[PDB]
Design a binder for this molecule. Structure first.
Ligand code: HEM
Ligand SMILES: CCCCC[C@H](O)/C=C/C=C\CCCCCCCC(=O)O
Ligand SMILES: CCCCCCCC
Ligand SMILES: CCCCCCCC
Length: 465
């Protein structure tokens, strides 16, 4: 491949980044922000300013990787450093996380990365016999409530009940604890939402006019002091509920305090937060796929469970080919977290489809994942949601290009890499979610709107089996 100069520029100090931030949030939106510049520069690799800049991030300058050939450099821990860049070119105050740099911010070169990731692997393994029954019980209650709401209002808001369901499910599955039996009662979603806002506001729009939003959430950090008492309520819940997991933390040589803040983060930010994005997005894409797809899913799911004596098991799920494929297609089409960063550790040569680009040690690399996973030089019908895309031997090969977990779907998270520690769990619960929908319903209709995280979704019909 020819070596090309990396196109793009950062504009003037102060005003360049501000204009780019306006495009990103208001005048273009993320997808068109990136696509318009791919067109202008005739390149899927280019220099661009990323939010937040202002007084939140020291340096907004990145090299963007916007195709599925260049993007995977972001996974290579021998090429990129992954320290303090979970959220990009700024890091939320450690005052938001008990004074600790939490696992997700740690480079694999840091010894506590191995210890803490092992702790989460244990959490997940130890929960294995609780996941199915607790998912089925909590999500059954959710669909009961949605049917109730639909009967009253003619529509049922998914997100504002499903957030409670997700936390209750996680508390019961991971910790054998029903939040209703604790001081948290039903408050957890509100507490976590506020705390997440204090962490991620520089990256989000909350729908307000830019004249309000820009000074309020895009210029300076919200003060961590204002969420400390809410966080303490969460901390005490984890400290008191996570006894069994804290025993393993002790054996791994992690302090009780550090383990607790890490369990809180993994459960509330990584898991509950990721589910908050993923589940409504899944309802949106599956809804749009139409009733014929719904009927095919219902037929497969119900037939398979019947073949399994009515027992839903991991092996039964492996028979649900369309279901597995639909879940992967949600993850490919609409990666729940679009932004992955990595700082070049050394000088690199980054290959794209038609050229290679040289980057210097210290440059911040950034990838907008949807452009890698909807790359038409990798996927046919790239901008179409194709339920059956991953069905069969040939379809399954394409899983190497599904990147939602910050690594190929064909690869395994390890203590040596920065791939999502919960990769198998996410894919499992996403499958269980589809299964619970279509064991109950033949088909459904939805109404859709915007949300600061993910999508706002109402059900307008739920056709019972
Ligand atoms: C739908 C839910 C989830 C989504 C969308 C998601 C997504 C991601 C992504 C994109 C990353 C890469 C972050 C980066 O460096 O840029 C990540 C990392 C991580 N996730 Fe997940 N995740 C989810 C659930 C979970 C669960 C269930 C766990 C429980 C262990 C978890 C724990 C972690 C941890 C600890 C990291 C950092 C890994 C490391 O430091 O090596 N996440 N996740
Ligand atoms: C509340 C955060 C939910 C996602 C948790 C998941 O485990 C990984 C997070 C990774 C990076 C932190 C920034 C998350 C920003 C998500 C919304 C904007 C986007 O998609 O880039
Ligand atoms: C009015 C509150 C806005 C909701 C913020 C949610 C961000 C996680
Ligand atoms: C949009 C940010 C509002 C800040 C909330 C502070 C109230 C404790």
């Amino acid at each position: 491949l020819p070596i090309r100069n990396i196109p793009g520029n950062y504009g003037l100090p102060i005003v360049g980044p501000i204009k780019d931030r306006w495009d990103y949030f208001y005048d273009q939106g993320a997808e068109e922000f990136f696509k318009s510049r791919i067109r202008k520069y005739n390149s899927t690799v280019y220099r661009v300013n990323m939010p937040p800049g202002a007084f939140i991030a020291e340096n907004p300058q990145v090299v963007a990787l916007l195709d599925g050939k260049s993007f995977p450099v972001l996974f290579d821990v021998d090429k990129v450093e992954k320290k303090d860049l979970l959220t990009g070119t700024y890091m939320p105050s450690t005052e938001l996380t008990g004074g600790y740099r939490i696992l997700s911010y740690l480079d694999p070169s840091e010894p506590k990365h191995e210890k803490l990731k092992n702790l989460l692997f244990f959490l997940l393994k130890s929960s294995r016999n609780r996941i199915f029954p607790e998912f089925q019980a909590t999500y059954s209650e959710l669909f009961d409530s949605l049917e109730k709401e639909l009967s009253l209002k003619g529509k049922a808001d998914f997100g504002g009940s499903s957030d409670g369901t997700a936390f209750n499910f996680l508390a019961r599955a991971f910790y054998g604890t029903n939040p209703a039996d604790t001081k948290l009662k039903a408050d957890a979603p509100g507490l976590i939402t506020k705390w997440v806002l204090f962490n991620l506001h520089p990256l989000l729009s909350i729908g307000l006019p830019r004249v309000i939003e820009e000074p309020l959430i895009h210029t300076f950090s919200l003060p961590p002091a204002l969420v400390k008492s809410d966080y303490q309520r969460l901390y005490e819940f984890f400290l008191e509920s996570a006894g069994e997991i804290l025993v393993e933390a002790d054996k791994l040589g992690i302090s009780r305090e550090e383990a607790t803040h890490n369990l809180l983060f993994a459960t509330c930010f990584n898991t509950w937060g990721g589910m908050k994005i993923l589940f409504p997005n899944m309802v949106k894409r599956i809804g749009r796929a139409g009733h014929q797809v719904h009927n095919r899913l219902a037929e497969e799911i119900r037939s398979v469970i019947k073949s399994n004596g009515g027992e839903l098991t991991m092996g039964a799920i492996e028979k649900m080919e369309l279901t597995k494929s639909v879940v992967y297609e949600c993850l490919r089409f609409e990666p729940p977290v679009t932004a992955q960063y990595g700082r070049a550790k050394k000088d690199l040569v980054i290959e794209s489809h038609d050229a290679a680009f040289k980057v210097k040690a210290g440059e911040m690399l950034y990838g907008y994942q949807p452009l890698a996973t909807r790359d038409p030089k990798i996927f046919d019908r790239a901008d179409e949601f194709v339920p059956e895309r991953f069905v069969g031997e040939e379809g399954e090969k394409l899983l190497r290009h599904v990147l939602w977990s910050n690594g190929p779907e064909t690869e395994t998270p390890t203590v040596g890499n920065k791939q999502c520690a919960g990769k198998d769990f996410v894919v499992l619960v996403a499958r269980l979610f589809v299964i619970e929908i279509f064991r109950r319903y033949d088909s459904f209709d939805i109404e859709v709107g915007t949300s600061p995280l993910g999508s706002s979704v109402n059900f307008s019909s739920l056709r019972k089996a």
